């Protein structure tokens, strides 16, 4: 099914290089700017969004009124929430780089995260726009055999669970 | 949906020609070498693996950290575990080659095997790499109208449940 996944606009921790999961931070001015640029660039399909503020706000600025689902949240980094990527222990770094065997204390494992994300996608009964996070987009892109790195406020359309259709970036 | 079926590397019973099911044998040195060679070939899709040592070790050396599922185990041969294929009683060997029905003493029936395997496959929610055994790979290939012979340490990619995409025999 055609799904459009949108990575929310930037927050302060994006420029600061800190892990941002369930910590509810707001979009920055540029983050809201990135979000407004999405209006008119996305199809008028039913919309779903992480309930986290930065996602909800991106959806709103993009001209949508999404139904909220915590299932679309970024992975829960547990004790690693807010940690600087730079000083992250090499084992955690490579776990995240290779996207496997990641189990932060007090948090969610990558395997649990993937099950949550794919279970949500499996339940969609028609094309939709999903306002979510970098990790969710990455999980989907990697499952489709592609690099999952996409700029904040950008989008990707896929034919789940078969292939990527288009990557949309706006300047 | 893209599935990669990987047959774990060789054990002593592979080269000895013995039925290997739930007997938890380790990989030989060559078996580990075969596993390492897969690292530069297999796509980085979510990974799952039989919980048996030889499959787990293959996944590890191939550069993966799989979720463990006993449903991916080879069939349980029961009293036939370790039995030489060459001297296998014609009544067992026939059953196995007819693919119509099979239930070794103290073992698992082919119907239970298949229930187990296909339940797992049908439950997958996204593309994946599956570290498993010859019988499982066989079962999948046959379900797609193909011949289920892949060397140890090799893989086959399929568009489940439609057709085979490519075979990777190293
Ligand atoms: Na035996």
Residues B113 and B139 sit within 8 Å (Cβ to Cβ): yes
Report the C-alpha gap between B64 and B91 in whole angstroms.
40
Report the C-alpha gap between A144 and B93 in whole angstroms.
41
Instruction: Tell me whether A17 touches chain B (CB under 8 Å).
Output: no
End-to-end CA gap in chain B: 24
Reported residue count of chain A is: 171
Residues A3 and A154 sit within 8 Å (Cβ to Cβ): no
User: Taking the mean position of all CA atoms in its chain, how far away is CA A75?
Assistant: 9
* B63 φ, ψ (degrees, to nearest 5): 95, 25
H or E element at residue B30: helix B29-38
Which residues, listed in sequence order, are joined to residue B168 by a DSSP beta bridge?
Answer: B155
Separation in Å, CA A163 to CA A46, A107, B130: 21, 30, 19
Q: At what angle do helices A134-143 and A110-122 cross, to 10 degrees?
A: 80
Report the C-alpha gap between B35 and B50 in whole angstroms.
15
3 state DSSP class of B57: helix
Compute the nearest-CA separation of B129 from chain A (Å): 10
B63 marked ligand binding residue: no
CA of B103 to the centre of ligand 1 (A): 14
Separation in Å, CA A135 to CA A148, A169, B26: 8, 17, 36
Report the C-alpha gap between A55 and A166 in whole angstroms.
21
Residues of chain B contacting A100 with CB distance shorter than 8 Å: 47, 64-65
Instruction: Tell me whether B127 touches chain A (CB under 8 Å).
Output: yes
Catalytic positions of A: 8, 74
Report the C-alpha gap between B127 and B47 in whole angstroms.
9
Contacts of B155 (CB under 8 A, 6+ apart): B4, B5, B6, B7, B38, B41, B42, B167, B168
Q: Which of B46, B64, B65 sits opposite A143 (nearest CB)?
A: B46
Phi-psi region of A39 (alpha: psi -120 to 50; beta: other; left: phi over 0): beta
Strand order, beta sheet including A155-159: A67-68, A47-49, A128-132, A2-7, A155-159, A163-168
Reported residue count of chain B is: 170
Report the C-alpha gap between A50 and A53 in whole angstroms.
8
CA of B81 to the centre of ligand 1 (A): 4
Catalytic positions of B: 8, 74
- Cross-chain residue pair A143–B64, CB shorter than 8 Å: no
Where do we find the tokens 């050396």?
B61
Give the method used: X-ray
Residues A6 and A58 sit within 8 Å (Cβ to Cβ): yes
Report the C-alpha gap between A48 and B125 in whole angstroms.
19
Q: Which two tokens stand for residue B168?
A: 């990777």
3 state DSSP class of B67: strand
Q: What is the maximum alpha-carbon separation in chain B?
A: 43
- Cross-chain residue pair A122–B125, CB shorter than 8 Å: yes
Candidates B5, B126, B13; CA nearest to B72 is B5
- Cross-chain residue pair A162–B1, CB shorter than 8 Å: yes
* B14 φ, ψ (degrees, to nearest 5): -70, -45
Report the C-alpha gap between B127 and A144 in whole angstroms.
7
Residues B20 and B47 sit within 8 Å (Cβ to Cβ): no
Residues A61 and A39 sit within 8 Å (Cβ to Cβ): yes
Q: At what angle do helices B53-61 and B29-38 cross, to 10 degrees?
A: 50
Separation in Å, CA A72 to CA A98, B4, B15: 21, 27, 49
SS (H, E, C) chain A: CEEEEEECCCEHHHHHCECCCCCCCCECHHHHHHHHCCCCCCCCCCEEECCCHHHHHHHHHCCCCCEECHHHCCCCCHHHCCCECCCCCHHHHHHHHHCCCCCCCCCCCHHHHHHHHHHHHHCCCCCEEEEECHHHHHHHHHHCCCCCCCCCCCEEEEECCCEEEEEECCC
Which residues, listed in sequence order, are joined to residue A157 by a DSSP beta bridge?
Answer: A4, A166
CA angle B47, B48, B50 (to 5 degrees): 145
Report the C-alpha gap between A13 and A2 in whole angstroms.
31
Instruction: Tell me whether B65 touches chain A (CB under 8 Å).
Output: yes
Residues A49 and A72 sit within 8 Å (Cβ to Cβ): yes
Compute the nearest-CA separation of B8 from chain A (Å): 20
Q: Which structural domains are found in chain B, ordered by start?
A: 1-170 (3.40.50.1240)
Residues A31 and A8 sit within 8 Å (Cβ to Cβ): yes
Resolution in A: 1.6
CA of B83 to the centre of ligand 1 (A): 6
Which residues, listed in sequence order, are joined to residue A7 by a DSSP beta bridge?
Answer: A132
- Cross-chain residue pair A114–B127, CB shorter than 8 Å: no
């Amino acid at each position: 099914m055609e799904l459009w996944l949108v990575r929310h606009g930037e927050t302060l921790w994006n420029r600061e290089g800190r892990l941002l999961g369930w910590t509810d931070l707001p979009l920055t001015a540029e983050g809201e700017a990135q979000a407004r640029r999405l209006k008119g660039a996305l199809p008028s399909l039913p919309a779903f969004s992480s309930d986290l503020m930065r996602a909800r706000r991106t959806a709103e600025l993009a001209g949508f009124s999404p139904r909220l689902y915590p299932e679309l949240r970024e992975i829960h980094f547990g004790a690693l929430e807010g940690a600087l990527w730079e000083t992250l222990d090499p084992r955690y770094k490579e776990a995240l780089l290779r996207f496997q065997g990641f189990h932060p204390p007090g948090g969610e494992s990558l395997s649990a995260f993937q099950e949550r994300v794919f279970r949500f996608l499996e339940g969609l009964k028609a094309p939709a726009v999903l306002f979510t996070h970098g990790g969710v987009v990455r999980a989907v892109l990697r499952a489709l055999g592609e690099d999952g790195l996409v700029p904040p406020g950008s989008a990707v359309a896929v034919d789940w669970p078969r292939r990527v259709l288009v990557r949309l970036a706006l300047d």
